[PDB]
Curated annotation (Swiss-Prot), chains A, B:
Appears to play a central role in the parasite detoxification system. One of its GO terms (cellular component) is cytosol. The keyword Signal does not apply. Transmembrane segments: none annotated. Residues 80-200 form the GST C-terminal domain. It catalyses: RX + glutathione = an S-substituted glutathione + a halide anion + H(+). GO terms for biological process: glutathione metabolic process. Keywords: Transferase. InterPro entries: Glutathione-S-Trfase_C-like, Glutathione-S-Trfase_C_sf, Glutathione_S-Trfase, Glutathione_S-Trfase_N, GST_C, GST_pi, GST_superfamily, Thioredoxin-like_sf. This is Glutathione S-transferase 2. It comes from Onchocerca volvulus. Residues 1-78 form the GST N-terminal domain. The keyword Transferase applies. Glutathione binds at residues 7, 42, 49-50, 62-63.
Length: 208, 208
């Protein structure tokens, strides 16, 4: 295959890219590296880190760059400058939430999970609930009727946050419905079931 | 003026955008707001944060989305898909260094500045020295002869690290020459002189 995605055997940073590839029926080698095997190959990557997408002869690190590249190549990058900018802005906001999430998971799970759920996460979700409403009244996908790369990022972020706090979307009807809509896309539902069967952890420390 | 960039009165995340606009001679309102005045306007921004670029009637937050929007408008986003991906990937690496730098600055300046300078920074710069070589032998700009948005981000990151450690580029000749090449661009030379004269803070806590 001409695509290989190299990452750890967790959802982590790679998962939005995996979701994009699966939902767009782009076949790829899902090259999942065990933690102890990474030091031997680390210098092969331009910043010594994963994920890495090999796209033919091109070696592309940086999760944001990988997803934006795929979006251009497969016409999931919006239809005009305003759209392209908007989904970039939106997806970058998703990455900011993921930074907060990961800091709590890796650095302070036992003490910071509950204050995160109660006192950080709701305000962050509220920003997305408001923003989502600006296209299609937020009642379909981020750009309205046409899927874009940002939808996969938002879906994964909402999904991992529901694992963390099953009630977190209760009071955010647009986000709750978006998550429902995405999970019901058949290629994503099938893949979710394979991923559950494989007992894939969200994060590298087994907490979630 | 039709372009307005709103950020705090520090370099921070806005500075690569300011550098883009200054170097490209895109006249803009440099809207620098005081810490204490942000609360009253925070809800006007899609994630409650700055920087924000107003481009005519378009309000764009997220520094990376702002930069890529400007890059598309002004043809500083590469000439083909591979270049577009490359500069993004490069810029994302710069942002990762900036995350490390800012964690040190804001969380541990008094005890971890010296370890950062000695033990973290050199290996991080080495990754850039190596990657920069891939186009134009690394002897000009990131894409070779043509400027891109990533050049401004790299320039700023090298500049703030030389403030931190004046000797940090001693062992990285491509980076050292690149930093000087950028600073010698006429619009940047003038701007940087004035920025230095005013001792514009790099960071919001005045440490650098
Ligand atoms: N900005 C990066 C971050 C990549 C990153 O932090 N990678 C981590 C895994 S989540 C890693 O490769 N750690 C292994 C190491 O540094 O040895 C990206 O979005 O791809
Ligand atoms: N991912 C964002 C980060 C924006 C951000 O962290 N903004 C900070 C300044 S560095 C801010 O507006 N702080 C004000 C606040 O949250 O009250 C971007 O690149 O623009």
């Amino acid at each position: 295959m001409s695509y290989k995605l190299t990452y750890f055997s967790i959802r982590g940073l790679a998962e939005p890219i995996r979701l994009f590839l699966v939902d767009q029926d782009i076949k790829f080698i899902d090259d999942r590296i065990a933690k102890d095997d990474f030091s031997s190959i680390k210098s092969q990557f331009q910043f010594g880190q994963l994920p890495c997408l090999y796209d033919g002869d091109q070696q592309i690190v940086q999760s944001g760059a990988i997803l934006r590249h795929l979006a251009r190549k497969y016409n999931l990058n919006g239809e005009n400058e305003m759209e392209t900018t908007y989904i970039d802005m939106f997806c970058e906001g998703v990455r900011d939430l993921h930074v907060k999430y990961t800091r709590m998971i890796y650095m302070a799970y036992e003490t910071e999970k509950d204050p995160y759920i109660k006192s950080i996460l709701p305000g962050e979700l509220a920003k997305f609930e408001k923003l989502l409403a600006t296209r299609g009244n937020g009642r379909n996908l981020i750009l309205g009727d046409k899927i874009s790369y940002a939808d996969y990022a938002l879906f994964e972020e909402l999904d991992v946050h529901q694992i963390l706090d099953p009630h977190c979307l209760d009071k955010f009807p647009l986000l709750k419905v978006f998550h429902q809509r995405m999970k019901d896309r058949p290629k994503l539902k099938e893949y979710c079931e394979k991923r559950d069967a494989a007992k894939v952890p969200v994060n590298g420390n087994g907490k979630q």
